[PDB]
Amino acid sequence: KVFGRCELAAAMKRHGLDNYRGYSLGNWVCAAKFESNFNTQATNRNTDGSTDYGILQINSRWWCNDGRTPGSRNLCNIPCSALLSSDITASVNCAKKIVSDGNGMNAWVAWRNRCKGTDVQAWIRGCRL
- Number of Cβ within 10 Å of residue 113's Cβ equals 9
CA-CA-CA-CA dihedral for 89, 94, 96, 98, to nearest 10? -160
- To the question of whether residue 101 is assigned a binding role by annotation, the answer is yes
For Cl ion, the binding residue among 65, 81, 85, 93 (CB under 5 A) is: 65
Ramachandran angles phi, psi of 2, nearest 5° = -100, 110
Q: According to the binding rule CB under 5 A, does residue 59 interact with Cl ion?
A: no
Catalytic residue among 7, 48, 52, 87: 52
> What is the number of residues in the chain?
129
If the CB atoms of residues 36 and 60 are measured against Cl ion, the closer one turns out to be 60
**Three-point CA angle 108, 4, 97, nearest 5°:** 30
> What value does the CA radius of gyration of the chain take, rounded to a whole number of Å?
14
Which range, of 5-13, 25-33, 38-46, 83-91, touches Cl ion by CB under 5 A?
25-33
Q: According to the binding rule CB under 5 A, does residue 72 interact with Cl ion?
A: yes
Identify whether the C-beta of residue 55 lies closer than 8 Å to the C-beta of residue 32. Answer: yes
For Cl ion, the binding residue among 10, 43, 96, 104 (CB under 5 A) is: 104
Known active-site residue 52: yes
If the CB atoms of residues 1 and 13 are measured against Cl ion, the closer one turns out to be 13
Q: According to the binding rule CB under 5 A, does residue 44 interact with Cl ion?
A: no
Chain residues in the site for Cl ion (CB under 5 A) = 24-26, 60, 65, 69, 72, 74, 104, 121
- List residues with catalytic annotation: 35, 52
